[PDB]
Each structure stands twice: as structure tokens, then as C-alpha cells.
């Protein structure tokens, strides 16, 4: 539980696209070299009130949250404490960070998970189950659905070099974990693209938040 | 005459001024119509002065009481003499001088 920490920063600035994974990751790596080589690090989605043009308006509860092992914080704290970064032509500022624990919950949820070479929902469930066994985890797999009930896919736009690649993923909800296995899931996660702002798992209330709108 | 006696007298005055400072402190601390404890404070001071077991004991107390007294001009005038007198001399004679000072502060008020 407390053996892993979620670094939270009060984030303020211009409104941000809702598929801003690579943008914020690249900006952070620009203002933090060691972030580009760490392994067990991941970033929580940035909350807020969205807009009509697929952009998110940052609010008071909007904050940049980073999942990290407690034995690697001193490699990231110098480059982010009070620091500011630019996403394109927009200015973003981070305050003094605060530490939040990894709490267990009965059910978990992930906004976007991607595993290479899996586009259909059924094989995605099978692959998430395979990674699920690889971690010694027990639970049941469900996919978050749209208003239509269709499983909801989310897309990440990595704008590497001149080109840009498309990676599509699903929202995965897993329940009945038992708190120890729940903590293992939130800390490991599924998908691997945790630096890419996808694989972090969260308690199940945010799943309802995303399913309402 | 006999500069040691001069140092002893100025030490008596220093201790008197320190107790004056502590009296001002306790008078500031008390509130409402309650009688400010002065006789109680003097008896407490005498009892703690009698209670002592050599060197560190009662010398720590002497220094702490002088600090509690605050600004004291007589000690300001003569630094090295009083500092050496406190560091040197058997502690029992310093106790005698301090007790005397207890009995000889009352001239001031």
C-alpha cells in the first residue's frame, strides 16, 4: 500500500486536449531528463471539466498525478517541484508536490489500456486476462461501455517525428480482487504504456464518472 | 579595595537585578485581580537554591535564573570579572552570595 506513492501536483494553465498523453509526457521529459529512463513510473489522467472541442478545461481539482516507487522520488522531485513546462504554445505550472498513498478498493478501473496487436474486444479481454494471471491476480474482467453499451475505445496519438501513430485501447474494469491483489494491480497496472499516460488503475468511482459522460 | 570584594558586591547587584527582571516577568504574567505570587515565588526560589548537588547542579540554575532576569546593567559593565567568578570559586560560596542577594534585593523595593 504505502510502499508506492502517487506524486500529485496542482496543475494550472491553458485547456488541454483529452488525448494529451504524448504531449504531457514529452513536455515532462523535456523538463525532466531522468523521467525518460525510469521503469516503474506512471501518470494518472488529468481531471477537469471537458469542452465541446475534445479539450479539457483545468479546474481547482485538476492535478498532475504521477505513480512512482518511493525509492526513486529524489530523482524526480528536483525537476518538478515548482517547475513549469510548455505543451506546444501553452504554459503549465506545477506547485510544491504532495504525496498520496496507494489505497486498495473492492473494484478498480483503467481509462485506457493498450496491448500490441489486439484490436477486437474479445482478444483484448483474453490478453488482459493473460497479463492478469502473469501478476498472480484474481478478478473478473469487464469493459466500460458507451451509452450505446458498445465497449468504449480510447485512442492515443503519439506524434513521433513528422508522422503520428495510432494506438487504440479499451477501458477495463476489474472487480473482486481482494485488497492485497488490488494493490498489486494498481501498482503494476496492465498495458505497459504507463509513461504514455494509459496503464494506471484507479478505484471504481472514476469509472462511473467516465461512464456518465 | 580588595577587588575580589568589589566583584562579590557587583555579583550581588547582578543577582538582584536578575530577580527584579523575573519579578517584572511574573507581574506581567498575572492577570485579573489575583494576587501576584511574590512571597510564594521568593520561597520557591529559596527552596530551589537550597536544593543542589554540586557543580552542574545550581550552576545551570544560576545561569538559567540570570537569563530569566533579562537585561541586567551591572553584569553588562563587567563581563570578564563576573564570568570568571561564576566559572571559578566553589559553588557553595556562590550559593551564599546568591542567598545574601535574596535577602538584599528588598532594599530596591
Amino acid at each position: 500500500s504505502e510502499e508506492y506513492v502517487d506524486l500529485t501536483f496542482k496543475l494550472r494553465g491553458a485547456p488541454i486536449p483529452l488525448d494529451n498523453g504524448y504531449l504531457t509526457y514529452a513536455a515532462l521529459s523535456r523538463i525532466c531528463p531522468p523521467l525518460h529512463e525510469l521503469k516503474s513510473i506512471g501518470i494518472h489522467p488529468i481531471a477537469g471539466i471537458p469542452t465541446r472541442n475534445n479539450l479539457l478545461e483545468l479546474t481547482a481539482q485538476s492535478r498532475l498525478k504521477i505513480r512512482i516507487y518511493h525509492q526513486q522520488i529524489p530523482l524526480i522531485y528536483p525537476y518538478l517541484a515548482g517547475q513549469a513546462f510548455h505543451i506546444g504554445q501553452n504554459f503549465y505550472q506545477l506547485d510544491i508536490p504532495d504525496y498520496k498513498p496507494l489505497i486498495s478498493s473492492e473494484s478498480v478501473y483503467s481509462r485506457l489500456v493498450i496491448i500490441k496487436g489486439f484490436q477486437d474486444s474479445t482478444n483484448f479481454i483474453e490478453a488482459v486476462q493473460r497479463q492478469m494471471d502473469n501478476l498472480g491476480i484474481q478478478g473478473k474482467i469487464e469493459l466500460l461501455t458507451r451509452q450505446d453499451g458498445t465497449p468504449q475505445r480510447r485512442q492515443l496519438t503519439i506524434n513521433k517525428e513528422g508522422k503520428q501513430f495510432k494506438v487504440r485501447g479499451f477501458g477495463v474494469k476489474i472487480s473482486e480482487l481482494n485488497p492485497e491483489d488490488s494493490l498489486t494491480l494498481q501498482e503494476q497496472g496492465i498495458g505497459g504504456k504507463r509513461k504514455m499516460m494509459c496503464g494506471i488503475f484507479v478505484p471504481a468511482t472514476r469509472s462511473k464518472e467516465e461512464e456518465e459522460t | 579595595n580588595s577587588e575580589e570584594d568589589k566583584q562579590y558586591l557587583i555579583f550581588i547587584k547582578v543577582f538582584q537585578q536578575a530577580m527584579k527582571g523575573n519579578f517584572a516577568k511574573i507581574y506581567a504574567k498575572t492577570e485579573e485581580g489575583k494576587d501576584p505570587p511574590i512571597k510564594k515565588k521568593v520561597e520557591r526560589l529559596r527552596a530551589e537554591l537550597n536544593y543542589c548537588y554540586d557543580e552542574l547542579s545550581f550552576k545551570e540554575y544560576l545561569s538559567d535564573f540570570l537569563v530569566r532576569g533579562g537585561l541586567n546593567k551591572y553584569f553588562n559593565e563587567h563581563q570578564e570579572e563576573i564570568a570568571l567568578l561564576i566559572k571559578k570559586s566553589p559553588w557553595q560560596e556562590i550559593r551564599i552570595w546568591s542567598l545574601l542577594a535574596i535577602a538584599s534585593y528588598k532594599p530596591k523595593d
Binding site: 504505502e2 506513492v5 510544491i96 504525496y99 498513498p101 | -
Partner: protein, 285 residues
């Protein structure tokens, strides 16, 4: 019958920055001292745990003299005169005005870190008004499990039924310290050793001990096991439970050992319910 409930409860592994000291020049040093084998161990003040218990009591009804504002951070007295007959807080923890000066039923000892405190300073930058300046300071943190000891003079309580909320509060202890608890460190126990007896003599004060900082298994001290096996600490008076029971049950000769006949439960809530049944039987509740 003069009944007493002593116990050593152990918390879960995690980071601790709870009860920082005078903060000599820049580092919020963790409260440390000397312990077994002469290695430095980090401590948590028992008064902090008592304050956490009082806050828990104030949270769930339980009329209490000292109300925590949670906004202005000011304790307000519901009544000027202390009345332990009516208030849970005055009945349990006592008071001192300087009236009645209640002795207080609950007694506590400071929580001692299971593993010695070696290193683990952390980088903390505090802000500054000097043209948005950030000065770096230090903060000590410790990754360990805190065990502490407590005793309840059940007969001393003005209302005998008030013991029951206390065990719940120990099980559901709120955040200790609050603002200075940098990493949110839970103090809900993960393994309990309770002795509900009727005589003043009390062992099991600090039964939990593992040492070997490389791991966090939180074994049981050989001294406590020997004391149980010898004949002291009547097994019918011994309540044991938590993750430590999982380790104990795997041990060889456990069935033959006198530790088996001691009241033992894998789940902590089973302990709490069975023990509370025992208390309500013994205190005529």
C-alpha cells in the same frame, strides 16, 4: 472483579514521517532513540495516538468535551467543568485542570519501529516569497511497522460500556498527526496480541519483533513464545490474530504447542467480536 485489558498491536509496513522533532537546522528529523541491541529506532509519541483515539470518539457521536474544529484547528470545551460521567473523553483519557483530575482508564506507550532507523532522508523543497524562490530542506522518513503497548483499567471507567467503542477506535484509528504525516500512514493494526486478564501482572508488552530490516514479515519474539509455553500467560486469557496468525499456523508442533489453545483467529474482526462478547459477559453488559 478488577479486570484489565492489555495489548500490543502492530501496524502495516509503510513510510513514516509522523512525529518530527525540533528540526535542528533544515531536516525535520524523525523522533528516534535507542532500542534492543543498541540500534537507533524511530518512535511515535503515544500522545498522538491518544489524540487520534479522541478524534475518532468525537467523530461518531460519543459526546466529548474536546471538539476538534477541523478548520480553525482549535479545541473547544463543550463544558468548562469536566464531567467523566457524561463525556466519553473525560471518562477514558482523564483530565487535569490546575477539580477532580481524573486518573484516566487508558494507558499507552510510544510506538517503536520494528526495524532500526538507518538512513532514508527525503528531498523536500519549501516555497518562498523571494521572487518565487524554493529552498531545499531535508525530511527523515522510515519504512517500518510500528508496534505499541496499551492497557485499559476497565474497572476504572465510570460507565463500563464505554470500553466497547475504544476497541473499535483502535481498529479504526484515524490519521495520526494529520498535516505533518507526509505519507499517509495508516495506524489500523494488522496483527493483535490481546490479554484480557484480571490481575495487574502484564507480559506481552512488546511481544512483536522481527529485526532483519531486509524484509517485513514481522515475526514474534522468542521471549513471548517461551513465556506462553512455560505456563505463564494463561492461554484462555490470550487473544492473538492478524497476519501473524497465518505465520503461526504454518509452524510445526503448533497443534501440540500451548499456543494453540490460546484464542486465535485469522481475521481480526472475528477477534473483535469474540472478545467483545467475552467483555459483555464479564462486565454484565
Amino acid at each position: 472483579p478488577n479486570y484489565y485489558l492489555y495489548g500490543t498491536v502492530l501496524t502495516r509496513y509503510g513510510l513514516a514521517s509522523l512525529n518530527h522533532d525540533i528540526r535542528r537546522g533544515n531536516k525535520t528529523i524523525l523522533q528516534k532513540g535507542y532500542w534492543n541491541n543498541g540500534k537507533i529506532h524511530s518512535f511515535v509519541g503515544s500522545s498522538a495516538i491518544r489524540w487520534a483515539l479522541r478524534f475518532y470518539l468525537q467523530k461518531q457521536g460519543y459526546l466529548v468535551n474536546r471538539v476538534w474544529d477541523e478548520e480553525e484547528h482549535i479545541n473547544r470545551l463543550t463544558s468548562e467543568d469536566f464531567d467523566p460521567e457524561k463525556f466519553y473523553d473525560d471518562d477514558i483519557f482523564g483530565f487535569a485542570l490546575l477539580p477532580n483530575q481524573r486518573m484516566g482508564a487508558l494507558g499507552m506507550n510510544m510506538a517503536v519501529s520494528l526495524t532500526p532507523y538507518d538512513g532514508a532522508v527525503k528531498l523536500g523543497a519549501k516555497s518562498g516569497r523571494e521572487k518565487d524562490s524554493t529552498s531545499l530542506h531535508f525530511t527523515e522518513y522510515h519504512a517500518t511497522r510500528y508496534q505499541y503497548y496499551f492497557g485499559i483499567d476497565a474497572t476504572h471507567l465510570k460507565d463500563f460500556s464505554r470500553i466497547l467503542p475504544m476497541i473499535d477506535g483502535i481498529m479504526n484509528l484515524p490519521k495520526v498527526g494529520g498535516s505533518s504525516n507526509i505519507f499517509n500512514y495508516p495506524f489500523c493494526p494488522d496483527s493483535l496480541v490481546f490479554q484480557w486478564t484480571n490481575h495487574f501482572a502484564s507480559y506481552i508488552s512488546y511481544c512483536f519483533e522481527y529485526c532483519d530490516p531486509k524484509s517485513k514479515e514481522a515475526k514474534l519474539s522468542q521471549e513471548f513464545i517461551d513465556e506462553v509455553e512455560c505456563g505463564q500467560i494463561d492461554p484462555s486469557k490470550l487473544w492473538i490474530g492478524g497476519t501473524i496468525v497465518k505465520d503461526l499456523q504454518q509452524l510445526d508442533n503448533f497443534e501440540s504447542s500451548p499456543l494453540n489453545k490460546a484464542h486465535i483467529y485469522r481475521n481480526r474482526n472475528e477477534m473483535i467480536e469474540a472478545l467483545k462478547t467475552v467483555i459483555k459477559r464479564d462486565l454484565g453488559l
